[PDB]
A = this chain, B = another copy of it.
Amino acid sequence: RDYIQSIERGFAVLLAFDAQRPNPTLAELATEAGLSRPAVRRILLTLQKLGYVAGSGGRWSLTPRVLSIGQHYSESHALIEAAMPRLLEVAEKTQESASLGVLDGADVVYAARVPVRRIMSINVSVGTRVPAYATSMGRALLAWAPADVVERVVAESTFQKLGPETIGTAAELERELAKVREQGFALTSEELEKGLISLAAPVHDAGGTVVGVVACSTSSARNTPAQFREQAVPCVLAAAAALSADMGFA
Task: Assess whether B147 is in contact with A69, with CB atoms less than 8 Å apart.
Answer: no
Shortest A20–chain B CB gap in Å is 7
* Interface residue A175 (Cβ < 8 Å from any Cβ of B): no
Contact of A125 with B by CB under 8 A:
yes
Tell whether, in the assembled complex, residue B75 and residue A19 are in contact, meaning their CB atoms are under 8 Å apart. Answer: yes
Inter-subunit contact B67/A8 (CB<8 Å): no
A17 touches which of B73, B103, B207 (Cβ 8 Å):
B73
Interface residues of A, Cβ cutoff 8 Å to B: 1-4, 6-8, 10-11, 14-23, 41-43, 45-47, 49-52, 61-78, 81, 84-85, 88, 91-92, 102-105, 109-111, 114-117, 125-129, 146-148, 151-152, 155, 205-207, 211, 247-248
Partner among B76, B114, B206 whose Cβ is within 8 Å of the Cβ of A65: B206
A88 and B152 contact, Cβ closer than 8 Å, known pairs A22-B76, A68-B129, A69-B69 = yes
- Report chain B residues within 8 Å CB of A75: 18-19, 64, 67
Q: Which residue of B lies closest to A71 (CB)?
A: B127
With contact pairs A11-B69, A46-B8, A71-B127 given, residues A109 and B18 touching in the complex (Cβ less than 8 Å): no
Report the bound CA distance from A47 to B43 in whole Å.
17
**Contact residues in B for A88 (Cβ distance below 8 Å):** 148, 151-152, 155
A7 to chain B, nearest CB (A): 4
Given A4-B46, A64-B127, A67-B69, list of 10 further CB < 8 A pairs?
A2-B45, A21-B76, A63-B78, A63-B247, A65-B206, A67-B109, A67-B205, A67-B207, A81-B146, A105-B115
Contact across chains for A63 and B6 when beta carbons are under 8 A apart: no
Chain B: CB-nearest residue to A109: B64
- Nearest CB on B from A119, distance (A): 13
Interchain CB contact under 8 A, A126 and B67: yes
- The contact sample of 16 A-B pairs, CB cut-off 8 A, is A18-B76, A61-B78, A62-B72, A64-B103, A64-B205, A66-B69, A66-B72, A66-B73, A67-B73, A67-B110, A68-B70, A68-B127, A68-B129, A71-B207, A85-B148, A105-B115
- Chain B residue with the shortest CB-CB distance to A84: B148
Are B148 and A19 touching (Cβ within 8 A)? no
